[PDB]
């Protein structure tokens, strides 16, 4: 998927954007799981 | 007794209050926003009945106690009841020290500022949480969507609105209000059940009827054709055991209850149905945001749990929207708790403590601070 | 990472900025000269919206952001915006180190000297290009012609002038100005669309209407006869899907928008139309340069993309010019990018570095140098 | 039953329709442009309720009936309603035979031609007036000024524009449009009242709120200083008996409602406030017309009835206009009926029948005639 | 005032003008009263 890697690599401002383009519509998700790491 | 903290994602869902920790997969607490007054208050050996621990206990042991929402119409008229409600929350099913954990709070649009003012200072004082933050339930569900663009029909717990968006960009001018609520359909269907030879006035009757809805009531894509069917539609006469025990018969009401969300004439609101409210919000939108809106037709609400609701959307728009454009209504199965999920994610936004309503900022800036440049 | 260098043929086209390397077959960068301010600036989880990266991104994701030209009327009022614009250019679609490559710049006639003064030193400092050079977009298109002699109607990006020439020999006395621009026709046609029962005020509406032009609007050789047709000319009622989606109807405006470039009465300029401006420039010309002018009637501009524009030329002159002489208007299909092509050739004129605005010459002679004995 | 005739000075004021005879000192008829649909339409012994005799009757006996403007946005979408409206006019408070008396009609700029086309033939046929004539309400108010030169801020019934003039000489290029209307401020203030803990959605609520404006709302010369006052300005909390009976409290909204006519950000119009629209119209004006404009700063509109409106004018211009020139804004107390007064004078211009739209001229030239070489 | 006399004496074209110079800014007026005579 690389959404893990690229949404821990992309901008944050654009973490929003590119979770929404690079397949993580649940940027909601991406952050909650990024947090499951840092939650 | 652990590391830094995890937020307190708490929702004051219009009908039920729901909440969990930061990034929880489900708000661990949910129950009606009722206050209970035992009618006759019989005297017995000892006691054991608290006035208004309603939570989820009261309705089961309902009847004597009446029902009260502090937030009756999405707006709270009493609070003492209500802060004791949150105490029940944080110490009976949250059973937690508010001072321990940050909490994000749900506030609906159009609230007078003083409402969130007080809710804040009271939570600070009584609950002394590390600090708090609040957000629009509509907006929280909107982050729960992740759909940066498009309008959302936030007909969820007990309210209805439209939330036009683009890349997270929503117009307050483009957002309207709908007083319609599960309570409203409640009153309507109770009315109809009564007029059809039934005595449906009692509170527990009120809960029963809402349940009758949630498990029975649907909506028909077509109105007159399905009503002509009901003239002889032998399918729809499913009668349901009245929970007291005698099967209560049901007919076309199983659908023609909520459609009034499109036609408030029978419910008696000059207001226009959900669909055309969405549509006119669309028109006020800019030129080409509207195709996305069609594709971003994100529905929201478990109250909107009815069958064919989305399909009725597409068809009604079609009747309204040009065929040139293509309509795509969204509606997650997880719509009523989607608000709490978005709250959990946002409060969990450990990159986003900075927006947090802390002790000091509040104290030096009093209550007014939370309102200026922040919420 | 290569040999000596290749020039940076960069055009600040009045509407769009365009550029390529020395001797490129097309300016690889082109996009509107807009600045974007999101109107309501909604607060969401995180960010992702830059204020004014308009480039080509903004208009697609337009609406919230408004529109701004630094060079509004062919003359630039703000620059911070504008140098950040060139940064977008050189690092997003030029994505190149300006210090690496020489760049020739486009400057329009009648500019106050300080404009090119600053544009220079700012490009030196911020962009530290090896050095630069600048030239008149009109003149660059004129080399793009290769037609040493004759006048050019440089009605291109957003400006209009006449460029009488002979063997490359043009008279500043013989060159005039026309404030008329695609913006002007824009305002006029927006006005007309509105007055015909339409609400055409919005920015994205502005882009839409210009596009409506560029793909629909033409010009009729004859005016009154074609207007009498329009009284019942059932051909011209082509209605075009408003990009929001509802087909927008069109009639005679599909032509009678730009003709005002000949009659500014309806647009309200005392100025005379393009044709008679050319003609009177012709009269001020010497005796026999004029036959060549007739043959060298080189048109220029994609704004002039309209059908029969050249033919309307020949006929109007004919009405003006003596039949004794023979009129030949020129108009390449490649007229709007012809300016950039001429710039690419000239900057590519590796026999012509000597005219180049270098670090030292500038520094010792400050900004004023580029103006004395050079440009 | 008298001598030759007297004109029918009839105004379709955007909110109310007003009219009188030629040279009358006041339009004897004025009332809202509403259409009424009784919501539930209860069945009783007999009848006595007409659908849409709204005139002035409906609003008093409002509620059941909804509200409708044929001319909703200064432009009419329905007419059957509307011609029956004029019938009410001419036979209930004009109670006169239209065939008897000539009538001048008010038409706003930017109207599609077909609008006045039909209004004409329908008035001819249904009303068979001796004949008619029409004129721009803006222009009629402008003759009501008698100020041959200068611009007028025609923010009157439900529209806003600027009317630059000189010796009666106005530039259509110099005249712009403002969608802002009493309806717009209505929506805004209703929004604010609701968000401050109030349920302001209902039609009669709409009339009540407009009245709340017209008798309460003002505008403060300064914005932030007066808003800081409102932080504790104990003067401005005048609460007004909600006409239902409970005093409705009021604060800073009593002023910060209409200022958005200068800042449409809060009302959400990219458009610029009235003042800078006037100013930029000024710039487009010629060199020295502008001093007169300063002196001929003629305001217009009862909607502009707010206190300090003119003073806010002079100060804002001052901030804009050079101190070298001297600014003089005009604003008659008789501004909303000034349009009707100018109409009465002009139609009364018995030296000016020749411009009159007669039976024959129309019939032989059909509807199109009134538009060519005349209005 | 003489506006009555001079605005029933001046040109008509310039009745406009001279009502506006000789004091009848309400040329509007002057005509409506001229009409009150001929209204």
UniProtKB/Swiss-Prot annotation, chains A, E:
Chain segments annotated as transmembrane: none
Post-translational modification note: Substrate for phosphorylation by PKA and PKC. Reversible phosphorylation appears to modulate contraction. Polyubiquitinated.
Coiled coil segments of this chain: none
Family assignment from sequence similarity: Belongs to the immunoglobulin superfamily. MyBP family.
Disease with which this protein is associated in UniProt: Cardiomyopathy, familial hypertrophic, 4: A hereditary heart disorder characterized by ventricular hypertrophy, which is usually asymmetric and often involves the interventricular septum. The symptoms include dyspnea, syncope, collapse, palpitations, and chest pain. They can be readily provoked by exercise. The disorder has inter- and intrafamilial variability ranging from benign to malignant forms with high risk of cardiac failure and sudden cardiac death. Cardiomyopathy, dilated, 1MM: A disorder characterized by ventricular dilation and impaired systolic function, resulting in congestive heart failure and arrhythmia. Patients are at risk of premature death.
Function description: Thick filament-associated protein located in the crossbridge region of vertebrate striated muscle a bands. In vitro it binds MHC, F-actin and native thin filaments, and modifies the activity of actin-activated myosin ATPase. It may modulate muscle contraction or may play a more structural role.
UniProt name for this protein: Myosin-binding protein C, cardiac-type
Annotated source species: Homo sapiens (Human)
Gene: MYBPC3
